[PDB]
Design a protein around this ligand. Structure first.
Ligand SMILES: NC1=Nc2cc(OCCCN3Cc4ccccc4C3)c(OCC3CC3)cc2C12CCCC2
Ligand SMILES: [Cl-]
Length: 193
């Protein structure tokens, strides 16, 4: 519907100030069509919002385009992804390339051990720049999930084709997309229905 569109909207939490956001709608989630995945300009995580019911969203507008519209071997690979720090020095995070992003062609879904939520980057550009090291190599979708150890509910929204024990989860209480490999320790408190 609004998938593939660029959007703008206000955001307000509680009595806080309204901030303005511009982004690109990537996906309307099949198991919950209220849920949209959005890439905001300049922000590297993928966000999920239930736009038709989230009272924090105001003044939702579709923007006009005004401009008219293979490294798939990276998919599934463990990588080391370098980036810049305040001090001028580079650091790196290690992670896994999950998939090509929808809608924004040249972009890839990736997640990281240090922050296992969904990110989206132009990985082939970063590779050409020397900032992406590829390491040598080497349904539950729609179910409810709960985390208790802390009692958090959500839904399994995607399975990663390249690594089928890996799933994307949307928790009811947050707008990040959480990524889990269900055989690992990070997933050991997740239970499904
Ligand atoms: N072409 C790029 N490749 C990047 C790779 C990055 O990091 C790859 C690992 C993930 N980040 C590590 C990190 C550390 C602290 C907080 C959040 C994160 C997320 C990246 O990180 C953001 C900067 C602040 C560090 C930014 C870029 C750009 C996007 C546009 C500017 C350059
Ligand atoms: Cl651990």
């Amino acid at each position: 519907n609004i998938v593939g569109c660029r959007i703008q909207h206000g955001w307000k939490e509680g009595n806080g100030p309204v901030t303005q956001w511009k982004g690109t709608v990537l996906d309307q989630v099949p198991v919950n069509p209220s849920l949209y995945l959005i890439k905001y300009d300049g922000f590297d995580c993928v966000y999920g919002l239930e736009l038709n019911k989230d009272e924090r969203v105001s003044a939702l507008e579709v923007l006009p385009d005004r401009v008219a519209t293979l490294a798939d071997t990276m998919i599934g690979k463990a990588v080391e992804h370098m980036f810049e720090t305040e001090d001028g020095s580079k650091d790196e995070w290690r992670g896994m390339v999950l998939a090509r992003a929808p809608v924004m062609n040249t972009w890839f879904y990736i997640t990281y051990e240090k922050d296992p939520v969904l990110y989206m980057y132009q990985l082939l550009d970063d590779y050409k720049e020397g900032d992406l090291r590829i390491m040598p190599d080497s349904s539950l979708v729609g179910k409810q999930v709960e985390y208790a150890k802390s009692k958090r509910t959500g839904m399994v929204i995607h399975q990663v084709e390249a690594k089928p024990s890996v799933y994307f989860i949307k928790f009811d209480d947050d707008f990040h997309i959480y990524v889990y490999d269900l055989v690992k320790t990070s997933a050991e408190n997740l239970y499904f229905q």
